[PDB]
Amino acid sequence: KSSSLSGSLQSFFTSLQTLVSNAEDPAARQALIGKAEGLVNQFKTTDQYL
Amino acid sequence: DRALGQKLQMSNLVDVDWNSVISSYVMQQAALQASYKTFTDMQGMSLF
Amino acid sequence: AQVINTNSLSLLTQNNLNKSQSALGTAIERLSSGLRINSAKDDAAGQAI
Amino acid sequence: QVINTNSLSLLTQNNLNKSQSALGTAIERLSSGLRINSAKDDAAGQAI
Amino acid sequence: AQVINTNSLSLLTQNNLNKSQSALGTAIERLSSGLRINSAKDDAAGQAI
Amino acid sequence: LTSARSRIEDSDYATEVSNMSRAQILQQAGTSVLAQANQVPQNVLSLLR
Amino acid sequence: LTSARSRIEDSDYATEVSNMSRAQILQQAGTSVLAQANQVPQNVLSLLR
Amino acid sequence: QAQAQNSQYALARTFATQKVSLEESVLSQVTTAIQTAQEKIVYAGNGTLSDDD
Amino acid sequence: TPVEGNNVEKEKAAAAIDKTNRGLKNSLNNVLTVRAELGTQLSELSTLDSLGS
Known part of the structure; x- marks a missing residue:
């Protein structure tokens, strides 16, 4: 219960926030894409186990 | 910097952590001991 | 159904030590470098900015 | 706290530079005997 | 009780240290500049007047 | 910019x-x-024989 | 030359x-x-039976 | 969740101060410029000046 | 290319200089973006391997 889905989820929200203040920045946008990929990864990985 | 990176690279190929091997080693020592107690007891019966 | 043999308790312990080791490595690296952000692993947006 | 960047030192250096410019101006004018030593001081006044 | 994952007293102390840091910086700044007012943070209405 | 870069x-x-x-x-x-923990198997060996 | 020699x-x-x-x-x-390791033969032998 | 909330606010505040301090500095220079402009204007009110002055 | 004594060449060289300034800005931003992408993957990998272990 530290790396479980929630932990990644709030981290994605955190990256989205940091984008909200630097709207033009390409780097932040790429970072948000990556965080989204990680989030979906955890979702599907747990679903695989079930 | 490149040399440090490749140094750490080499370790991953050839080195091994001590905790893992040590932990396995002690246990397997004990397992061998119980195994031989098997022999001791069967021989002790064997005298019949 | 017990792990006296596999230890388990021992393997478990070990993994926690790995977590602590990673924490110590990060702390040492940052404290020696003087920078929180030493590589793209620290942050993406931070690196760029 | 931060080890590697003394922001306050930079700020104090900037203030030192301010005072330095004022000091240089004072000495220059004091020595020349003139307020208008160059076009910088009072351009139209210099022309007049 | 002794919790080793979080030394609460440490964070408690760190906050107060930062508290001090701010005031020291302010004092040194004012002493250097020769002005009570340096930035609008100091005194807005006074800045204007 | 120096201050921000620092932060x-x-x-x-x-x-x-x-x-x-x-x-x-x-x-x-x-x-x-x-x-x-690694002794625990020793505890159980002493247990075992 | 002194620095070069040092290197x-x-x-x-x-x-x-x-x-x-x-x-x-x-x-x-x-x-x-x-x-x-020397105990190893010692163990295996001492168990003579 | 609440911890992450506070962290997000921390990031936001960092960026906000980043903008605002710079704005203040440039405005201070602007104020100095306006002051010296006014100073020049008074000079213009002088009636003993010729045209090239 | 020498420019002294001439016109045209001085201004042409200045134009190329400004062009390169702009281009360097853009290239810097691009490289930083790629570095950001790599950093994100680099961070993700450690979480993945802890999961696996």
Whole structure:
């Protein structure tokens, strides 16, 4: 219960926030894409186990 | 910097952590001991 | 159904030590470098900015 | 706290530079005997 | 009780240290500049007047 | 720009130092408990024979 | 010339300090494992039965 | 969740101060410029000046 | 290319200089973006391997 889905989820929200203040920045946008990929990864990985 | 990176690279190929091997080693020592107690007891019966 | 043999308790312990080791490595690296952000692993947006 | 960047030192250096410019101006004018030593001081006044 | 994952007293102390840091910086700044007012943070209405 | 660059880049030594202490204590304690853990199979061998 | 000669001559203090420490630890480990290693025949024999 | 909330606010505040301090500095220079402009204007009110002055 | 004594060449060289300033800005931003992408993957990998272990 530290790396479980929630932990990644709030981290994605955190990256989205940091984008909200630097709207033009390409780097932040790429970072948000990556965080989204990680989030979906955890979702599907747990679903695989079930 | 490149040399440090490749140094750490080499370790991953050839080195091994001590905790893992040590932990396995002690246990397997004990397992061998119980195994031989098997022999001791069967021989002790064997005298019949 | 017990792990006296596999230890388990021992393997478990070990993994926690790995977590602590990673924490110590990060702390040492940052404290020696003087920078929180030493590589793209620290942050993406931070690196760029 | 931060080890590697003394922001306050930079700020104090900037203030030192301010005072330095004022000091240089004072000495220059004091020595020349003139307020208008160059076009910088009072351009139209210099022309007049 | 002794919790080793979080030394609460440490964070408690760190906050107060930062508290001090701010005031020291302010004092040194004012002493250097020769002005009570340096930035609008100091005194807005006074800045204007 | 120097101030902002600092706030993004630099490390806060007190934070990493306390993290260091946390990590060191964790590592030593965990190695101790791991030694006792590896003995646990010895406890059960003494149990076993 | 003095600096250039130094770069050919001198031994790096930190590097060799670390090497010496590593070597002491390795030799300690080797000696202890050797004690247990000679015990190995001792164990297997002492169990004579 | 609440911890992450506070962290997000921390990031936001960092960026906000980043903008605002710079704005203040440039405005201070602007104020100095306006002051010296006014100073020049008074000079213009002088009636003993010829046209090239 | 020498420019002294001439016109045209001085201004042409200045134009190329400004062009390169702009281009360097853009290239810097691009490289930083790629570095950001790599950093994100680099961070993700450690979480993945802890999961696996």
